[PDB]
Write a protein that binds this DNA or RNA. Structure first.
Ligand SMILES: [Mg+2]
Ligand SMILES: [Mg+2]
Lengths: 67, 226, 55, 104, 73, 98
RNA sequence: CCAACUUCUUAGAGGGACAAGUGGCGUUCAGCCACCCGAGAUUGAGCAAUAACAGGUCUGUGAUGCCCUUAGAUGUCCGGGGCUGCACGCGCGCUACACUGACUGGCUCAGCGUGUGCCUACCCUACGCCGGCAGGCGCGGGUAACCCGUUGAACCCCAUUCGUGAUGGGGAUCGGGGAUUGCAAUUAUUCCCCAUGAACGAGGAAUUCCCAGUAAGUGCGGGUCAUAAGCUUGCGUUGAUUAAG
């Protein structure tokens, strides 16, 4: 049931490409970044986009993801 | 006299509000009626009719305003004129769903084809800034047995609670020569104003991302003392 | 006629005297909170009263 | 005068009575009166239930309509000449305000 | 509120964490972590609350999950 | 109906002093509400106003259970011919307001 | 001011948890499984697409087409009967077949919610004094986080009596008396008392519901209601087993 939807996996690639330098590998800081930088309508997908953006922040610093 | 409980006050003006909305629909059907808005005061209360064609509720110096505050008076029991109508032209004339539901009510009574008339109105909502709409005509078309036409053109959601205010539904009836026709128009409204013409509070299936700024001065430093 | 006994059976207590508020049924009505509407009638204005759902 | 007044406010919707709450809060405190806060009496939810069908055919469904009325309540002390500018600083169709009689 | 055994777990819960909160505030936390050691490893649910609740009835059977008997003929 | 003459004047004079009246479709009530004093039940108000429609002088709709009317302008020039009133004595249909 | 406060009571804004942390599995891709910390590492439900059905509803609808009827009217009202009639078959459901219980007396702890009417006239009732009991009487609150109401609910807890018995388990059947609702209680409206004490000893082939505050036992409040719950709808409690040619 953990598998993440499209519009969360769509909205993460538009963020982390465009704000790769304004981030980190911390979920609770990137939570606050994602609300600042784009209008999220509600809290649940706020920190659920932020989770997948952090899921790439420990990741695209290693290997060739679409980065 | 003696006074009743709050739980029977809120249903009393809840059921007051429904009744005159029923009759004024029965009375101002031909006008692009589209609802009411009521203000209860301990003074002259103020009902307003949101009619598009505001002429046809007026006569010579408000004929069908003054008695349509008097039929409301001597039914519900107001004092002598603590209630008044005001006719009011609504903005986005064919974008509120009830209005053209009343228009194509009378446009089917002139004897048109259903496909000619609906392509009239389907092109009329979707030209009127509507993000999406779809119109259903049900009833006794060609044959003994009755069938159903629908004219989806545009985007429209169906579930969640935000099919409450991005959309409105209007269901009306058209008495034709045999039986009764069924009209069922639903229209999805644009987010655009955060304000007047549409709803606020954007639809949660998309993220409105913004650009980064001009990224000025990354280079070797500078300073000013002022 | 002959008004001594015409409507004489006492329309008082009992569901032959309670009626539907909208268009004159007497079955399945809702006397809760003094609404006086039959079950079929209540659903159409449902929002028009203000009873929204869970959502 | 000098009195003891209580103003009440209740509605179906909550967001409108949240603002009418704070507006009379600031509307006494701009005239620097003394207020006791908005007391939170519990929300009255009535849950009338119907069988959702016009006939007897179905698979025994039911729908649960409900209306939650919120109610809040505030004392003041001031004389009741200014019950008009307590009345007429907000119009607001969906709220129902009352003021308790001022014999103290 | 409660019942007969819904209450005695409620006072067991209560006076377990009562002195733990007196020992965050009027003795050190070394001894508080000491008394939290004995309480947690022995059936932990004393001073941490039990979360679950009633899980309401639905509209087709006699409770939360039970249903009425269906009759095919 | 059977038209008692002093009662029909009382229902016409209320229908002449303004252009509204709000009879309700429950004919087994002894006392018509807007009149309530000159001893009229609801059948008298029904079947007099029903006589008017077939001539066309009044014009109706129907609410939930209330049975409203409106006064066509031919009705006004008939009501003066029943109540002996000149073409200065008018209803409230024309204007009293601002 | 002849006290300080919000911890429970209550809402409101906001915070909170995402499968991020840790290892293992896996094209090191979506992810999966183990623990770390945590109140929470799947809370329950509502709205639910296209395209359908000769599904149901003309006996809700001043929604309606057609057809029939229209005064020795299927319109309308009053009076009595009727849907409740019983050689029989089937379907949801309630009690029981006991000793893990039935009695008797102690003893005790809930939540949701509703309450006097524009018309419509009958509401929840605490207290007091009469009665073995239903109930009757005056006197008072309550249009309600104000009164009923700290809602002294049941199961259960404990002390006695009862002992494997068709038994004091079980209460169908039925006679007599007694009270309230009402225009009227008979074909018993309900309630109370005394008496009567039938099958029934765990249920054939078959079949239904259900996986954690779950089934199940257990009461309670709504709806309908003048008098009314063996129903339904909610709440609480005790709580487990496993085509470009
Ligand atoms: Mg109907
Ligand atoms: Mg035995």
């Amino acid at each position: 049931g953990r598998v993440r939807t499209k519009t969360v996996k769509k909205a993460a690639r538009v963020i982390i490409e465009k704000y790769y330098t304004r981030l980190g590998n911390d979920f609770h800081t990137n939570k606050r970044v994602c609300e600042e930088i784009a209008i999220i309508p509600s809290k649940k997908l706020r920190n659920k986009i932020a989770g997948y953006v952090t899921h790439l922040m420990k990741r695209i610093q290693r290997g060739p993801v679409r980065g | 006299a003696v006074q009743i409980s709050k739980k029977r006050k809120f249903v009393a003006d809840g059921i007051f509000k429904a009744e005159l909305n029923e009759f004024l629909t029965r009375e101002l059907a031909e006008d692009g009626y589209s609802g009411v808005e009521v203000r209860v005061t301990p003074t002259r209360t103020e009902i307003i009719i949101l009619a598009t064609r505001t002429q046809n509720v007026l006569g010579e110096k408000g004929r069908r305003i003054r008695e349509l505050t008097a039929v409301v008076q001597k039914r519900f029991g107001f004092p002598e004129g603590s209630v008044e109508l005001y006719a009011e032209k609504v903005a986005t004339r064919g974008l509120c769903a009830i209005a053209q539901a009343e228009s194509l009510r009378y446009k089917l009574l002139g004897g048109l084809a259903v496909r000619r008339a609906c392509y009239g109105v389907l092109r009329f909502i979707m030209e009127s800034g509507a993000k999406g709409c779809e119109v259903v005509v049900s009833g006794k078309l060609r044959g003994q047995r009755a069938k159903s036409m629908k004219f989806v053109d545009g985007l429209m959601i169906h579930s969640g609670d935000p099919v409450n205010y991005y959309v409105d539904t209007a269901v009306r009836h058209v008495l034709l020569r045999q039986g009764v026709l069924g009209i069922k128009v639903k229209i999805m409204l644009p987010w655009d104003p955060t304000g007047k013409i549409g709803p606020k509070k954007p639809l949660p299936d998309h993220v409105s991302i913004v650009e980064p700024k001009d990224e000025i001065l990354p280079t070797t430093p500078i300073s000013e003392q002022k | 006629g002959h008004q001594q006994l015409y409507w004489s059976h006492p329309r008082k207590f009992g569901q032959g005297s309670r009626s539907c508020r909208v268009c004159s049924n007497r079955h399945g009505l809702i006397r809760k909170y003094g609404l006086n509407m039959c079950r079929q009638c209540f659903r159409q204005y449902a929002k028009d009263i203000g009873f929204i759902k869970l959502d | 005068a000098i009195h003891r007044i209580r103003i009440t406010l209740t509605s179906r919707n909550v967001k409108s009575l949240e603002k009418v709450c704070a507006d009379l809060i600031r509307g006494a405190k701009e005239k620097n009166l003394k207020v006791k806060g908005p007391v939170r009496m519990p929300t009255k939810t009535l849950r009338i239930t119907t069988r959702k069908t016009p006939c007897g055919e179905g698979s025994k469904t039911w729908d649960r309509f409900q209306m939650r009325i919120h109610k809040r309540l505030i004392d003041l002390h001031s004389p009741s000449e200014i019950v008009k500018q307590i009345t007429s600083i907000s119009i607001e169709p969906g709220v129902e305000v009352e003021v308790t009689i001022a014999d103290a | 509120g409660g019942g007969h055994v819904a209450q005695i777990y409620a006072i067991r819960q209560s006076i377990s964490k009562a002195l733990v909160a007196y020992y965050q505030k009027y003795v050190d936390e070394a001894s508080k972590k000491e008394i939290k050691d004995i309480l947690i490893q022995y059936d932990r649910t004393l001073l941490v609350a039990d979360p679950r609740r009633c899980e309401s009835k639905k509209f087709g059977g006699p409770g939360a999950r039970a249903r009425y008997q269906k009759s095919y003929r | 109906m059977l038209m008692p003459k002093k009662n029909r004047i009382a229902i016409y004079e209320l229908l002449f002093k303004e252009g509204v009246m709000v009879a309700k479709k429950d004919v087994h009530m002894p006392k018509h509400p807007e009149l309530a004093d000159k001893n009229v039940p609801n059948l008298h108000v029904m079947k007099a106003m029903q006589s008017l429609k077939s001539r066309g002088y009044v014009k109706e709709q129907f609410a939930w259970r209330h049975f409203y009317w409106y006064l066509t302008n031919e009705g006004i020039q008939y009501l003066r011919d029943y109540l002996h009133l000149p073409p200065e004595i008018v209803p409230a249909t024309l204007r009293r307001s601002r």
